[PDB]
Structures are given as structure tokens and as C-alpha cells.
Amino acid sequence: PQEIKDVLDSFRRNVQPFTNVAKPIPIDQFGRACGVGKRKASSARAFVVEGT
């Protein structure tokens, strides 16, 4: 019945969590992807490419 449909709508929880998706690492036109790492006080940038 419409009476139960209304009272039930008052018990619904319309909370939406925040969305934070990381941006994917692209691949340069020359086929090299840049990754970033860190440690105690250092920061690295590695360009990985198909090679030997």
C-alpha cells in the first residue's frame, strides 16, 4: 500500500561516500612510462621502456 511506501522512505539512508580515483599512468609516444617513488627523504623518477 501507499501508506507503507511512504513511511519506509523515511528510513532510507541517502549518504554518498566521496570518490577519489587515482589518475592512470600514461605511456609516452616513445613508449616510456614515468613512475614516482619516495623514501625517508628521497624521491625517484623511473622511465621504464622496452629494452634489453
Place this chain on the structure above:
Amino acid sequence: IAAAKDPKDTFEDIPLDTRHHTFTKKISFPKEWLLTEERKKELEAARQQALLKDA
């Protein structure tokens, strides 16, 4: 500029002294590693020679 134009002493004997300046050397990504259509063929050869050597 007036002292530079003075033909009395050209100081050509004196080499230019650059000890006050600290030259910096910059590194660049090797151009031989750029994955181009020509290098792909180069890797295919190495990748295939490796299989033969072990086989």
C-alpha cells in the same frame, strides 16, 4: 668599452679565466632507447637470438 677599444694592450696573451663560474652538466634521456619502429625490429632480433642461444 673605451678600455676595450684601447689598442695599447689587447691582453691576447691572457687566456679567459672562468674559475669564478661553476659550470653545470645536464643529463638527458638516451636517444638510442626511444622505442621507434626501427628499434622494435632491433629488439625482436635480440629477443629471438636469446631464445636460440638457450634452445
